[PDB]
Structure 1
Amino acid sequence: AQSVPWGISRVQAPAAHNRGLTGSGVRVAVLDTGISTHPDLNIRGGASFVPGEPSTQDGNGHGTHVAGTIAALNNSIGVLGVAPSAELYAVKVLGASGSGSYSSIAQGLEWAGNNGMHVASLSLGSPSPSATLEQAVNSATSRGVLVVAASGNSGAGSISYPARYANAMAVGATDQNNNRASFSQYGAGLDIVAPGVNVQSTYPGSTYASLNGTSMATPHVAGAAALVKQKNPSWSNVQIRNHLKNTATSLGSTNLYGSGLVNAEAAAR
C-alpha cells in the first residue's frame, strides 16, 4: 500500500499530479550524502566528490530521505514524492559521517551546471560564508540551475550559507500547525517555507523513516520547482523561483516565513 506523508499533502502535490504534473523530464540533483538504491526510487545517475567514497550509495541515510521527498515513485508501495517522475541524480558531496569540504560541495554544483540539471537540492549549511561556495552557487545559477538550500536548524534569527546568498532559494521549515518549527532559522534572505517536522521518507535498507530538519523542508520546494518546470518548460531558474514565492500561502511574518508555505497546486497551474 502506498501512503502520502503529511508534508506532501500539505504542499498540495496530489492536486498537481491529478492535472498530470509529475516532474517528468525535469532533472534534479540531490547534493548530499548519496542516494541508496531503493524500491521506491528511480536513480538515473550521479557522481561522488568524496575521496574515500567513490560510490553514490548513501552510508548516512540523509540523502536517501531527501530524494524520497522529491521523487518517491507513484506506485503501490512506500511513499510518494512531490515530483514522482523527476529524473533524479545522486550528487555525493558529503561522506557517511555527514561532513565534507566546501571544495566537494563546489565540485557537485559545477557538475550540476555541467550536466544540465534544472534544480539542485542542497542539504548543507554553514554559519560562515565561503567564497568558494558562493562562486559555485553563482556559476550553477548562471548555467540555469535553480539552487535550493536549507536555512539551518540553529533556531537563530539569521540564516545559514549558502542559503543566505542571493542566488540560492532559502527554505525554512514549518510544523503541522503551519507555525515555524523551533529549530528553523529565519530572517534576511529567507524565501519560503515547507513541511519539516516528522517527515516520513525512503531510507537505506529498503525502509522508511521520519526525520526533522530544514533539510527535510528543502526537497518539498525542489520538487515543487520540478512541477512548475514541467508545466512551463521555457521558464528559467529565476522565473520558477519568483513564481513559487508569488503563489506561496502567506503564514504571517515574512521575517519568519519569507513568502509563506509553498503551494504546488497554486504554482503548477
Structure 2
Amino acid sequence: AQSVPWGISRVQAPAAHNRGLTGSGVKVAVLDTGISTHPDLNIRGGASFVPGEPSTQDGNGHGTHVAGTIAALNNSIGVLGVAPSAELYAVKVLGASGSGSVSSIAQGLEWAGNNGMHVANLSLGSPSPSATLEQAVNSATSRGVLVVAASGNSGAGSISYPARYANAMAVGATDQNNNRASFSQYGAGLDIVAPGVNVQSTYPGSTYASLNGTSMATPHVAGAAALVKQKNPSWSNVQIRNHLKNTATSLGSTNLYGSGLVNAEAATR
C-alpha cells in the first residue's frame, strides 16, 4: 500500500494528479548528496561534482529523501511525490558527509543549465555569502532553470545562501498546523513555505524515513513547479515562480511565510 505523506496532501498534489498533472516531461535536478536507486524512484541521469565520489548514488540519505518528496512514484508502494512523473536527475554536489564546496555546487548549477533542467532543487545552504554561488544561481536562471533553495534551519530572521540571492526561490518550513517550524529561517527574500516537519520519504536501502527541515520543504515547491510546467510548457522559470507565489495560500506575516503555503491545486486550477 502507498501512503500519502501529510505534506503531500497539505500542498494538494493529489488534486493536480486527478487533473492529469504529474510533472511528465519536466526535468528536475536534485543538487544534493546524490540519489540512491530505490523501487519508488525513477532516476533518469545526472552527474557528480564531488571530488573522490564519482557515483551519483547517495551515501548520506538526504538527497534520496528530497528526491522522493519531489517524485516518488504513484503506485501501490511507499510514498507519493508532488510530481510523481517528473524526470529526476541526480546532481551530486554534497559529499556523503552532507557537505560540499562552492565549486561543486556551482558546477552542478552549470550542468543543470547546460542540460536543460526546468527545476533545480537546492536543499542546502550556508550562513555566509558566495559570489561564486551567486553567479552560478544567475547562470542557471539565465539558462531557463527555476532554482528552488531551502531557507535554512537556524531559526533566525534572515535566510541562508544561496536562497538569499534574488534568483533563487527561497522556501521555508511549516509544521502540521501550518505554523512556522521553530527552525525555519525567515526574513527578507523568503518566497514561500511548505511542509517541513515529520516528512516521510524514500531513503537508501529501499526504505522510508521521516525527517525535519527546510530541506524537506523545498522539494514540495520544486515538485509544484513541475506540475505548473507540465500544465504550461511555454512558461519561463519566472512565470512559474510568480504563479506559485500568487496561488499560494496566504498565511499573513510575509516576513515569516513569504507568499504563504504552496498550493498545487490552486496553481493548476
TM-score range, shorter chain: over 0.9
- The RMSD of aligned alpha carbons is 0.4
Q: Give, in angstroms, the shift of residue 115 of structure 1.
A: 0.1
- Partners of 2:132 and 2:157 lie apart in 1 by 25
Cα distance in 2, alignment partners of residues 148 and 20 from structure 1: 24
Aligned counterparts of 1:268 and 1:230: Cα–Cα separation in 2:
9
Q: Tell me the distance in 2 between the aligned counterparts of 1:98 and 1:176.
A: 26
- The alignment covers a number of residue pairs equal to 269
Q: Distance in 2 between matches of 1:145 and 1:174?
A: 25
Question: Is structure 2 residue 221 aligned with structure 1 residue 221?
Answer: yes
CA offsets 1:237-265 (integer angstroms, 9 cap, x no match): 00000000000001120000000000000
Measured in 2, the distance between the counterparts of 1:6 and 1:123 equals 20
Give the equivalent residue in structure 1 for 2:165. Answer: 165
SS at match of 2:2: coil
5+ long unaligned stretches in structure 2: none
Q: Deviations over 1:165-198 (max 9, x none)?
A: 0000000000011100000000000000000000
1:100 CA displacement: 0.9
Distance (whole Å) between structure 2 residues aligned to residue 88 and residue 116 of structure 1: 12
Q: After superposition, what is the alpha-carbon deviation per residue over 1:32-86, rounded to whole angstroms, capped at 9, x for unaligned?
A: 0000000000000000001111100000000000000000000110000000000
The 1-side partners of 2:151 and 2:7 are apart by: 18
Cα deviations by residue, 1:224-243 (Å, 9 ceiling, x for unpaired): 00000000000000000000
Matched residue SS, 1:46: strand
Equivalent-residue separation in structure 1 for 2:147 and 2:225 (angstroms): 10
Q: Give TM-score, length-normalised by structure 2.
A: 1.00
The alpha-carbon deviation at position 219 of structure 1 amounts to: 0.1
The alignment partner of 2:202 has SS state of: strand
- State how far apart, in whole Å, the 2-side matches of 1:185 and 1:264 are: 23
Q: CA–CA distance in 2 between the matches of 1:35 and 1:173? A: 22
Query: Take 1:251 and 1:181, find their aligned partners in 2: how far apart are those partners?
Result: 13
Specify the SS of the correspondent of 2:69: helix
Report how far residue 268 of structure 1 moved: 1.2
Shift of 1:123: 1.1
Distance 1:27 1:173 in 2: 24
The 4+ residue runs of structure 1 with deviation greater than 2 A are: none
Question: SS of the counterpart of 1:208?
Answer: strand
